[PDB]
Design an enzyme around this catalytic site. Structure first.
Site, PDB file in Angstrom:
ATOM      1  N   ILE A  16      -2.613  -1.085  -2.152  1.00 54.34           N
ATOM      2  CA  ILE A  16      -2.200   0.111  -2.345  1.00 54.34           C
ATOM      3  C   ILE A  16      -1.079   0.361  -3.024  1.00 54.34           C
ATOM      4  O   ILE A  16      -0.612   1.402  -3.163  1.00 54.34           O
ATOM      5  CB  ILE A  16      -2.606   0.835  -0.821  1.00 54.34           C
ATOM      6  CG1 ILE A  16      -1.548   0.408  -0.095  1.00 54.34           C
ATOM      7  CG2 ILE A  16      -4.015   0.719  -0.481  1.00 54.34           C
ATOM      8  CD1 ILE A  16      -1.161   1.384   1.020  1.00 54.34           C
ATOM      9  N   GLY A  22       7.504  -6.707  -1.820  1.00 53.66           N
ATOM     10  CA  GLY A  22       6.258  -7.111  -1.603  1.00 53.66           C
ATOM     11  C   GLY A  22       5.381  -6.161  -2.034  1.00 53.66           C
ATOM     12  O   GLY A  22       5.503  -4.981  -2.530  1.00 53.66           O
ATOM     13  N   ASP A 129      17.663   3.743   2.613  1.00 58.56           N
ATOM     14  CA  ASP A 129      16.559   3.898   1.525  1.00 58.56           C
ATOM     15  C   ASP A 129      15.564   5.277   2.024  1.00 58.56           C
ATOM     16  O   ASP A 129      14.477   5.138   1.393  1.00 58.56           O
ATOM     17  CB  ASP A 129      15.875   2.908   1.163  1.00 58.56           C
ATOM     18  CG  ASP A 129      15.163   2.721  -0.179  1.00 58.56           C
ATOM     19  OD1 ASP A 129      15.768   3.577  -1.082  1.00 58.56           O
ATOM     20  OD2 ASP A 129      14.114   2.379  -0.355  1.00 58.56           O
TER      21      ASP A 129
HETATM   22  O1  LIG Z   1       7.422  -0.998   4.553  1.00 56.56           O
HETATM   23  C1  LIG Z   1       6.158  -0.851   4.684  1.00 56.56           C
HETATM   24  C2  LIG Z   1       5.637   0.197   3.777  1.00 56.56           C
HETATM   25  C3  LIG Z   1       4.148   0.487   3.720  1.00 56.56           C
HETATM   26  N1  LIG Z   1       3.723   1.304   3.063  1.00 56.56           N
HETATM   27  C4  LIG Z   1       2.629   2.204   3.130  1.00 56.56           C
HETATM   28  C5  LIG Z   1       2.002   2.777   2.240  1.00 56.56           C
HETATM   29  C6  LIG Z   1       2.093   2.923   0.786  1.00 56.56           C
HETATM   30  N2  LIG Z   1       1.658   3.580   0.018  1.00 56.56           N
HETATM   31  C7  LIG Z   1       1.711   3.670  -1.229  1.00 56.56           C
HETATM   32  C8  LIG Z   1       2.905   2.651  -1.860  1.00 56.56           C
HETATM   33  C9  LIG Z   1       3.451   1.797  -0.924  1.00 56.56           C
HETATM   34  N3  LIG Z   1       3.109   1.837   0.288  1.00 56.56           N
HETATM   35  O2  LIG Z   1       0.656   3.349   2.750  1.00 56.56           O
HETATM   36  C10 LIG Z   1       0.777   3.077   4.058  1.00 56.56           C
HETATM   37  C11 LIG Z   1      -0.115   3.489   5.071  1.00 56.56           C
HETATM   38  N4  LIG Z   1      -0.083   3.515   6.156  1.00 56.56           N
HETATM   39  C12 LIG Z   1       1.346   2.427   6.592  1.00 56.56           C
HETATM   40  C13 LIG Z   1       2.112   2.216   5.733  1.00 56.56           C
HETATM   41  C14 LIG Z   1       1.972   2.514   4.284  1.00 56.56           C
HETATM   42  C15 LIG Z   1       3.461  -0.268   4.640  1.00 56.56           C
HETATM   43  C16 LIG Z   1       4.093  -1.203   5.826  1.00 56.56           C
HETATM   44  C17 LIG Z   1       5.242  -1.659   5.381  1.00 56.56           C
HETATM   45 CL1  LIG Z   1       5.953  -2.597   6.716  1.00 56.56          CL
END
Ligand SMILES: Oc1cc(Nc2c(-c3ncccn3)oc3cnccc23)ccc1Cl
Length: 262
Positions: A16, A22, A129
């Site tokens: 996603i 990461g 951030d």
């Molecule tokens: O630090 C983190 C950032 C994200 N980012 C999450 C994103 C996401 N969407 C688009 C781009 C990047 N991240 O979508 C999500 C939906 N549910 C939960 C977390 C996320 C997830 C886990 C961690 Cl540990």
């Protein structure tokens, strides 16, 4: 207690996106979950330190408005596991799909974000951030703040001048977080990313840094309350020490929110 997760337990689905060191995926582990994997082969010793920091910070947090850390794993690849938030980031709603929210709702998002930040600060965590990308709107009605490559004890653009012009050891502080929060108030109240009429990123960074440019607070929705406009200016102060801390921000929003329905 230990929150480690044995290999093979965790299933990885849709890629996603990306986040602080990461790739993020949708996964399943006792339900569906967000998984942030650093998927190379040999881990960097520096990233090893970065990974062990977010985990350290996350296992310090338990609060509705903080993305619920669930577990981590090292084998096979280093991975953080948090709850899945259906719907999207505040950035996504506002600047991509253009979800038009209502002031009462926008104020609510502001309050909840303020809520998680007070908690973060109370427990002496500095986010470093905060931005609408890192504020996920779960089930389209609960804010979870969530990206933690950061400190306890480039997306520009949300950076305070002091942070921009890295002149001194530590530019990051509670007030810089407060500043970032200010830009998010801006995005909520205007529906825009700031400085949309300058088409040059360098010029944006140079000028915010020298205090020549600042968000144009005249751009806010007319139904945005006076006190909110007032609060934003305080949060967006060019001088670090001239900004209010999160308890005060939280009382501010709570007050204006209460006398708003009319
Ligand atoms: O630090 C983190 C950032 C994200 N980012 C999450 C994103 C996401 N969407 C688009 C781009 C990047 N991240 O979508 C999500 C939906 N549910 C939960 C977390 C996320 C997830 C886990 C961690 Cl540990």
């Amino acid at each position: 207690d230990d929150w480690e997760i044995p290999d093979g337990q965790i299933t990885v689905g849709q890629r996603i996106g990306s986040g602080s060191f990461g790739t993020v995926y949708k996964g399943k582990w006792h339900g569906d979950v967000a998984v942030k994997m650093l998927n190379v082969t040999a881990p960097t010793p520096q990233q090893l330190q970065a990974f062990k920091n977010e985990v350290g910070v996350l296992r310090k947090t338990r609060h509705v408005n903080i993305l619920l850390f669930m577990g981590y794993s090292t084998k096979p690849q280093l991975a953080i596991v948090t709850q899945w938030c259906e719907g999207s980031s505040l950035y996504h709603h506002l600047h991509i799909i253009e979800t038009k929210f209502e002031m009462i709702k926008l104020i609510d998002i502001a309050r909840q974000t303020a809520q998680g930040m007070d908690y973060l600060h109370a427990k002496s965590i500095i986010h470093r951030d905060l931005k609408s990308n890192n504020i996920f709107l779960h089930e389209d009605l609960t804010v979870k703040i969530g990206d933690f490559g950061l400190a306890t004890v480039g997306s520009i653009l949300w950076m305070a001048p002091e942070v921009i012009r890295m002149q001194d050891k530590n530019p990051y502080s509670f007030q810089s977080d407060v500043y970032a929060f200010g830009i998010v108030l801006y995005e909520l109240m205007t529906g825009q990313l700031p400085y949309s009429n300058i088409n040059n990123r360098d010029q944006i960074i140079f000028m915010v840094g020298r205090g020549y440019l600042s968000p144009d607070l005249s751009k806010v929705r007319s139904n945005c309350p006076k006190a909110m406009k007032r609060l934003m200016a305080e949060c967006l102060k060019k001088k670090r020490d001239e900004r209010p801390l999160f308890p005060q921000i939280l009382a501010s929003i709570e007050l204006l929110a209460r006398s708003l329905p009319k």
